[model samples]
Target: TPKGTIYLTFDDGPVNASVEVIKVLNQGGVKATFYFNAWHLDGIGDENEDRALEALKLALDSGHIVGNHSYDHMIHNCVEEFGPTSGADCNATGNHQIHSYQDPVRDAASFEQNLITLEKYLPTIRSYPNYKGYELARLPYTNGWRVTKHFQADGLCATSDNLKPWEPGYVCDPANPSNSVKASIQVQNILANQGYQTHGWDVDWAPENWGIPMPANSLTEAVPFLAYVDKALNSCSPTTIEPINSKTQEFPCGTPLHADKVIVLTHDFLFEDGKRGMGATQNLPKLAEFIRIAKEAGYVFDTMDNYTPRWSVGKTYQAGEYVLYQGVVYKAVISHTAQQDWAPSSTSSLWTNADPATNWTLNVSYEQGDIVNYKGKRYLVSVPHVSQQDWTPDTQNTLFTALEL
Candidate 1:
C-alpha cells in the first residue's frame, strides 16, 4: 500500500524567487499550491521581487495551483494603525504588535482584494483549469484551519493583543487567547461562511533558527526531512505538535478528512539568494531531491484543491465513487471511463451532484429514492428508470413524486 499523501505548499509568493521554485517543482514532476499575497504582483514588493508578474504567470502555466494568502500579508493592520505608507516601516521593524489584524470583517475583505488584484493581472486566472481561486486560503502569519465542520482549529497564540508572538516573554493561554487571536478565529468563521476552506500546515519546513539569515544557516536536508513527513503520517503529529511562536495547530488527527495526509509549509523567499540567504543555491536542490525520495517512498503529492479527490479525465471510475469538481462534490452513477468532455458538472448520465440541487435531466439512469429539482420544485424518483424529455416529473407521476420543500 502507498503511504499517505504530502501537500507541499508555498506561501507569500509570486516574487522573483517563485519562478525558480516553480521550475524546481516541474523538474521534480510535482505540483504545489502557492498561497500568494497580491501586493507583490502589484509592483510594490521587496527589492528583489521585480519579476513578480512573470513568476505568477509561470506558476499557472506550469500547472501549479495558485491560492490567496491575502493582500499585503495583512499589512492593512499596519496601515490602519499608522499612516497609509507605514506598512513599509512595520515590515522594517518586524513589529507584529502593530500589524495584527484587529477587525475580522476587514481582514476577510483582504482575501477578496487579493483575488481582484490577481484577476487584474491575469484576467483568465479564474478560468484556469487548476486555479483554486477563493476555494482555498491560509491566513497570513497564522496557523489556522477551517477545512470542514469537524476539522476546524485556530492558532490561539498566533498573535497577541498586546505583544507579538515572537516577542520576548510572550505567553498564550488557549483558554484565554489574546484579542488578535480571537479576531483571527472570527476571520476563519467569516471565510468559511463565504465557502472558503482554509488549511494549516502539519509540518513546517524551515531552518532550526528562524531569526538567523538563511545563508548563515541551513534547512533540514532532504533525507531527514522525509523522516519528519513519515513521522507525521504515522503518528498524526498535528495533534501533538509543540507550539513555536503560536504556530502549532492541534486539530483532530484521526478525523476522516485528516487521515493519511500531511501539509508542509515553506516559503518562496526562503529559497531566494538575496536578503534572506543562499537558499536558492542550497534548498532548491534539496526540494527536488525531497520530491524524488518521497515519490520513491510511495507518498503521492497533490494540491490543496485535492484535499478530496479531484475529477479527472482518462480515469476509470467505479459507481458510487465521489470526486470534487469546482468546489462541488459529485458521485458516479455508473462505472465508466471518464472522457475529456465528461466533467462532473456536465454529463448527468454518468454522475450526479452529491447535493440534492441536481436538476432533473434527460437520459439519466435514475435510481430509487434519488432526489432532483425540476421547475423550481424537488422530486424523488419513486421508480428506477431512464429519464426522457417527455417523461417530465409532472407527467410521470408513477415514476416520480413531489418532495416537500
Candidate 2:
C-alpha cells in the first residue's frame, strides 16, 4: 500500500451532531467518510433527518466516502454463537458473540438488512455518485470480515477483544490470546470470501462520551485523540500473511499502509453537542482542522479503495514493483497459485468461470483484470461482482488502490 491517504470516517450517524460535523468538514473544505444506518431516523434517531441528508450530500459533494455501517449497530453480532440458534428462531440460538459464528450466513444478514434499509431511505446513487453508492460497505465498528483471513462474518460479528479506551466500554484486546479473537478472525475470513473489504480505524475523532450524559468539561477528548492523529502515517503491512489465532500469533495488521491520509474513526451519534453539549465537541473542531493540518504536514486525504485487491479478469500479468491500474494501485504476488486462490485464510473462493478442475478462475488479485497461468491452466482472477450494485469497481474506479468499501 502507498503512503499518505487519510480517510476521516464517521460511524452510527445521520443523527445528532452528524449535521454539524458535516458542516465543520464542509466549511473547512475537508473530505471524509460517513458510515450510517437507518436507525438514525426514528425518535431521537430522527432528530436531524434533513441535516443528515445534507451531511450525506456534503460528504460526496466535497469528495468523501459515504459508507454503510449497518442498520442498527446490533450488539448481539458482537457477542457470541450467532446464527440459527439452537433454540429455534435465529435470535434464540444465542448471540453471535463476534467470534464464534455458528452461522456466517445468518449473522451477516444483519449487514444485508442495514443495506436494504439505508437504500430505501436514501439510495446509493443519491449519496455516492462515483460509487453508485450501491457497492461499498463498512462493518459496524469493527474490521470488515471480507478483506482479511479471519473473516467469518456470515455466521458471526466477532471482534478482536471489542475493547476501547476506558470511557464507553472495555471488552478485551484482540492481542490478548482468547477465543473471542479467534471467532472474530473467522468471521473476517468469511466476509473476504464474499467479495468485500473490512477496515480498522486509524484515528479516533469522537469524544470519550458515548452513552453517558455530557459533562461540561468532557469536550477535551480530542486532546488525547488528536495526539493519535499526529504524524499518523506509514503504518501498514501487506495483507499477505494470515492472522494467527490464540492471541500469540496475533491478527495481521490493518495498520496504516499509506502515507497520504490518516484514517480517522468517529461516530455521528457521539459528536452532536457543539462546544457546549454532549459528545465530542472538541473532537469535531480538531477533526475539522485535519484538512489544514494534514496538508500542512504534507498529507492528503484518501479512502478505502486505496487498498482494494486488484487483478485483471482476463489479462496475464507478472507481480513486482507496484503497478497502477484503473486509477488504483497495488503490489502483486504472482507466484503462489496453490494456496486458497484468494487470501490463504479465506477457505472460500469465488470463480469468474465455472468448473474449477478445468478452469480455475480465481477471484481477487493485487491488480484489476490480472490473470495467471498455473499448473498449465489459466486462472481468470476477479472479485465476485456484487449482484446488487449490478456493476463492478474492479477497474473503473481506481478500485484497486486508495479507495475503501
Candidate 3:
C-alpha cells in the first residue's frame, strides 16, 4: 500500500501567497489539492484580489488539482444577517459567518455559482485531463466529508455553532441538529448526487494562533508536524475520525478508507506576506524542508484527486487475506490488527510475501499435483502443507518440484 498517503490541501486561495506554495510543491515534484474561492477571481474587493488568475494559471500549469470553495463562502449563510449586500459585507474583516449551511438551497446555489465564477476565469478548465472542479468541494468553516459510491458521513458535533433559530446561543441536539447541520447534510447529498466528492482534514498544519487568515506554523516546527503525520497514519490522530468510516465498514478489511490516508488542511494565505503572518519568506522554506523530511521518512505526497491507498489503518486481516504496506504487498498469516510499523514482511510473524505474489500466498494448503507458478516457473506439489513465503520447490523438493525437475 502507500507507506501512507498524505493529501496536502489548501483552501481559500488563488491569492498572491499561493504562488509561493505552488513553487515549493513544484520544486519537490509533488502535486497538491487547492480549494479556491471565486470571489477573488471575479476581482471584487475580496480579501484575495488582483493576483488571483495568475495563481490559478501557475497551479494548473504545475499539475496541481483545483477544487471549488464556494463563491462568497460565508455570505450564503448570512443572507438574512447581512441582507442583499452580504457579499460586500463579507469582504469586511472580522465579519465571518458563525453558522453555515443554514439554507441548503442557497448554500448549494452558492456552490453552483462558484463553478460559474471559475468558468469565467478558466473557461477551458474542463478540457484539462483529470480535472473536474465540481467533483471536489469543501464546506466553508466546517470539517466535513462525503466520499463516493457508498461512503457518506459528517462532522455532526464538529464546528458546533448550530445556532437554534429564535434562540440566544448555540444549543442544538446532534440527533436532531439545527437547520444548518441538516441543510449541510442536504448540501452534501445534493453535491454527491451531482457527482461531487468532499473531504475533510485529519489535521490542520498551521500556527498556534488560528483567528487570522493564512496563519502558518513556524519553519523550525517541522519536527512536530512530522510527529502529527505519524499519528495520523496510525489512526491515533487527536482529531476524531468520522465513525461511519472510522472502525467498521461492510468489507473484509473493516477499516475506514480515511484511516491511513492523511488529508492535511491549510490556507493559501499561509504562504503569503503583508496582512498575514510571516509567510513565503520563512514558511516557504519550511515547506520545502518538510517535504524533504517526509519523503525521507517514506511518506508519499499526492493530490486528493489521486489519493487512494490500498491499506486502511486498524483493519483486521484474516489468514490468506492480502494487504499492501509501504509499497510492498503481503498476505496475512494470522488474524491481526494492522499497525503502522507492523507492515508485512518476511521477518514478521504477522504477515509474509515481500511483494504481491498470489501464488506464494499465506495459509493455503497445497494438494498433490496442484500446479503453481512462482517467481518465473511452474511447480507441482509433491506434499501438502499451508503455502508460505519461505516455502519453495527448490528448498523442499519432497514437498514440491519444478515442473520438469
Candidate 4:
C-alpha cells in the first residue's frame, strides 16, 4: 500500500492440488503468476495426469497468468545423471539430491520442447489474448532473472552446492566451475533473443520446517509470513542470512528500486492433500488467511506480468532524468511529465530517440532554428523564444520550417 508492490508467483504447478492454491488466491481476489511444467499432462507414470490438464485449464480460465517453467522441468532434460534414488521422478518428488548439467544444447532444447508440449494442450495459446506466445518463463531449479529491456541477472549459487536450503549435496556441472552458470546463460540468451522475459524470486514463501515433501509454511505462521514480507521490503531476504549462497545475490530489497515490490516463490503442491499429507487441509485455508492479512496490512497483490516497473509513475521527467520501459534506454530531452503511454520509444514523440533522436523538450521555449518533433514531424523554430500551445510550428509555418522540407 505504501509504495511497494508484490508479485505473487507459484511454480511447479498445473497439478491437481494447484486448484487449492488457485481457490485461495481467487477467493482473496488476487491474481498470481503460475510457472507451469506440463510434464504430468503427458500421463506417463503419473496416475492423475488428466487432473494436471484440468488444472492447467482451470488456472488459465481463472484469470491467473501462466509462464513456461520448462516442459520437463530439468528432469529427463538433464544431460548429466542424478544418482541415488533419482531419475525423471525427481521433479514429481521434488528431489534434486545429486543433479548436474548434462549439455547446454540439450538443456536449452528442453525449454523449447516445453512450448511444443503446451501447444498440444492449449492449442489456442497463441490466439489467447492473455498468452503472448513463447515469452515469460522461470528457470527450473534456479532463482534467476531476465527482466526489463536491459536488466539481466543470474543466480550464480542457487543450485550449485545444495538442492534445497537444508539438504546437502552437489547440484551442478563441476568439470567447469561455472558450467551451470554458462549453461543457464545460454538458455537465457536463447530466450532473450526470442523476446522472452524470465524472472526470479525476491522472497520464497517456503515451509518453516522441512523434511516432508511439498512442505509449506504451517497455516499458523501466516502472521509471521506477513512480517517477513515487511522485512523483505526493508532489504533483508531469507536467503541473505550468513552461510547461505550470498556471493551473487541480485535481489537486495533495501534498494528503493525493489523495496516497493516483492516477487514471492512457492509451489502449488504445497496446498495439495495427496501423498504429501494434509497440506490442503491446513495450508489452503492458511493461504486465504495470509492473503487477507496482507491485504489488511495495506499491501496490494499483483501478478508478475503487471508488476510495478522501475520508472517513477506520474513523476515529471526533465533533462538528465531517466526511466526504463520494455528495456530500451533513454535520457530526458526537454522536461515534461513522463506519461504512462509516452514511453521511451522512437514512435513516441515525448522521448528522444536513444539511437538518434534530439534532446529537446516539448515544453521548451523555442528560439529561432530550434528543432523539435511535432505532429509526427521535425521542425526548426523561426520565431525567437516562442512558447505557446496555440503557436504550433505546423500552423505558424512563418514562425517555423519543416526540417525535412
Candidate 5:
C-alpha cells in the first residue's frame, strides 16, 4: 500500500526555467501544479522569463494543474503603498512587503486579473481540460490557506513589513503579529469568499541558505529529500511545519480531506541558470531523482486540484481512485473508462458514493437542497440539519418534503 501522497507544487513560474521543469516532470511521468504569475506571460517579468507563454502552454498541454499565483507577484502592493517606480523597484529587487496588498478586496482582485490575462493570451485556456480556473490559488510571499469551510489557516509571520522573514535577527511574534500580517489574513478571507481554495505549503523544497539569489549549491540531495517526505507523512508535517514563518497552517491530519498527504512548495525560477543559480544543471536532476525515489517508497504524485480528484468523462479511473462529482464524493469500485452517460450517480456498480445512504441515515449532514430516498420514495431536505435516527422523512414533514415523482 502507498504510504502517502506528495503534491509537488511550483510557484512563481511560467518563466524560462519552467520549460525545463515541465520537461523533467514529464520524463518522470509525474504531474505537478504550477502557481504562476501572469505578468511573465505578458513580457513584463525579468529578461530570462521571455519564454513564459511557452511554459504555460506546455504545462496545460502536459496535463499539469496551473493555478493563480497573482499578477506581478504582489508588486501592486508596493505600487499602492509607494509609487509606480517603487512597484518596478519592488519587482526588480524582490522586496515584496508583508502587507503586500493593503486592501484585501483590491488584493483579491489580482486573482481575477491574473485569470483575465491568462485567458487573454491563451483565448482557449478555459477550455483546457486541466485548467482549474478560479477554483485554486496561492498567495504570494505568504503561507495562507482557505481549503474548505472546516480547513483554513494563516501564515501570521510569513513576511515582515520592514524586513523579510529570511533576514537574520528578524522576529515574528504571532501573538503580536505585524499589521501587514493581519492584512494578509484578511486577504485569505476575501479570496475564500470569492470561491477560491487557497493552499499553503507543508514543506519548502529550498536550499539550506533560503534567500534571494538562491543557488542550487546547497540543495538537499534526492535520497535525503526522500527522507523529508517520509518525515512529513509520518509526522503529519502540516500540523508542525518548518522555517518558523510557514508554521501557521492548521491542517487537520487524519481527516478524510488531508489524510496522509504532503504538499511541498518550490519555485520554478530556482531551476534556471540565470541570476538565481545554475539550478537547471543541478536542481533539475535532483527533482527527477526525488520523484523516482519517492515512487519507489510507495508514494503517489498528484496535482493539487485532484486532492479530491474530479470526475471526467473519457478518463480511465483506477479501482481505488476517489473523485468529486456534482456535490458528492465517489470512489471507483472497478477500473474503467468513464462514458458520457455513465456518471457516478448513474452507475452504482462501478462507483460508490462516499455517502452510501441513498436513503436518509442518522448523523449524516444534509444541506437544504439535498435529495434522498426514504422507504420507497424520494424527498428533498427542506432545511440543513444533521439527520437523527427517528426523524424519518415520512414523519419529519417540516424537515423534508416528499417529491411526487
Candidate 6:
C-alpha cells in the first residue's frame, strides 16, 4: 500500500545537490517522493531553468513521485493566529485558537499556489504513463493543509509524523501529538463521509538532526534506518500510527474516516549530498544491507498505481505462501478473477492498486510463505508484530486489498 514497506522520502529540493541525489536514487533501482516548493525553483520556470529542469526532469524521468508541499512552504501567518477561531477567521474555521483562515476558501488559495507555481514542469512528468503518479501529495509543515471542505475537494490527504519527537531537535511527538494530527483527521472524516481517502507517512527521510550538514551519507546507510523502517511497518502500537487520523470513527469525536484506506506521504524533495538526510555520506554496504534486509523480509517496490482501497479482497486465497502489500498474513483462500472456457480468461469484480488490469500482487522468499487471499486475488504478506497480531489488521492489510476494477 505504501510503495512497499520502506518508503524513502526527501524534502527541500531543486538544489544543486538534489540532482546528484536523484542520480543515486535512480541507481538504487527504487523510487522516492520529492515534495517541492516552487519558490525554491528560483528564476527557473520550466524547460529553460537548467538546474530546475535537471532536478525536476530527474524525478519525472526516474520512477519517483513528485508532489506539492506548497509553493513557498510558508506559514503565511504566525503559529498563534494561523488556525480556525483566530481573530483572523470569520467562518467555521472551528477556533483552532490560532492564526488561520476561518473560511477554508481563503486557506485553499495557499494550497493552490503550489500548482500554479509548479505548473512549469507538468509537461516533463506526463511522458511516463507507467507511473501511477497524481494519486499522491503532501501538505506543508502539517497534514490535511486544513480540515476544511476545500482541502477535501482538492485531493489533499492527512499525514503522520513519527521521527523521534521530544528528542533534542525532534519536531513531533506521538505521546503528546500536535493539533495538526487531530485537526487534519477531523477534516478527513468529512472527506471519508464523502468517499475520500487520506494518507500519512510510513517513514520520514528528513535528518533534521544529523551531525553532518548534507544528506549524502544517510542516503547510503540503509541497514540501520531500514531496521527502523521494519519496526514501523511491523508496529501494532497506536503510537506508531498515532500521527494518522483513524478512519474508524463516528465523526465529531475524531475516529475512523474510512475503515479501508491507508494513505502515505513522503516529501517530494529527499536526499542531501547523496545521503538520506543531513547525515555523513553514502555507504554501499549500508545501502545493500538495507535493501537485502527489507526485500528478504518480504518487502516489494510499488507506487500508488499498484495499490488502492478496495471494498473487499474480491476472492478467497491463502497466505504464508505470498507477501501481501500490507505485510499481514492471509491465512485462508483468496481469488479475484475467473477463467472462461472456450476463450482465454474471465475476471472478477476485483480492485487493486490504482489500476484494475494488474490488480493482485505478491512477493515471496524461498524459505517463507507470506501470501494472502483477497476474495479472489493474491498479495505479498509479512510476519505480524507481537502487537500487530492483537488487532484486526487495517483493510490495507486484508479487507480492502483491492480497488474498484
For model 6, the stretches where C-alpha displacement exceeds 4 angstroms are 1-4, 43-50, 78-103, 130-134, 143-197, 206-221, 241-270, 273-289, 296-298, 309-405
RMSD of 1: 7.4
Tens digits of per-residue lDDT, candidate 2, 1-405, equal 333556777777666477677778777675666776655543224244546556555556666666656554554444343232221232333232333333445546655676676566656545455432233556543443343322212212234334322325544443343354444444444443344455655445443443455533354443354455564544432121122221112223442223334566656655555433544554566656656665665556656654443344444434432322332233344532333235321122222121101112233332335433334443443543311121233432333222222
Best by lDDT: 1
Comparing 1 and 6 on lDDT, the stronger one: 1
Q: Note the clash tally of each candidate.
A: 0, 70, 2, 10, 0, 80
lDDT by candidate, in order shown: 0.78, 0.45, 0.66, 0.63, 0.77, 0.39
Candidates in descending lDDT order: 1, 5, 3, 4, 2, 6
Per-model TM-score, in order, reads: 0.77, 0.58, 0.67, 0.71, 0.76, 0.50
lDDT string for model 5 (285-367, tens) is 99999999899989999998877767898999988666777645566778999998888863366765453234565545568
Q: Write the per-residue lDDT of candidate 6 for residues 1-405, one digit (tens) a residue.
A: 333444454554555556766666666677766666565565422112247757776777776766544453433432344332222232233222233222333343444566565555555454564322232344444433212111131111122233323235444334454444554434333333322223344444443344565544444245666655655553422224333332211121222221222233333333332324432234334444555566676676444322332133333332211112221212212443322221111121121111111122232111113333345555443443211122222345432332233
Per-residue lDDT of 168 in model 6: 53
The lDDT of model 2 is: 0.45
Stretches off by above 4 angstroms in model 3 are 79-88, 91-97, 158-173, 211-220, 236-256, 308-405
The TM-score of candidate 2 is 0.58
Best by TM-score: 1
lDDT of 4: 0.63
C-alpha lDDT of residue 162 in model 2: 40
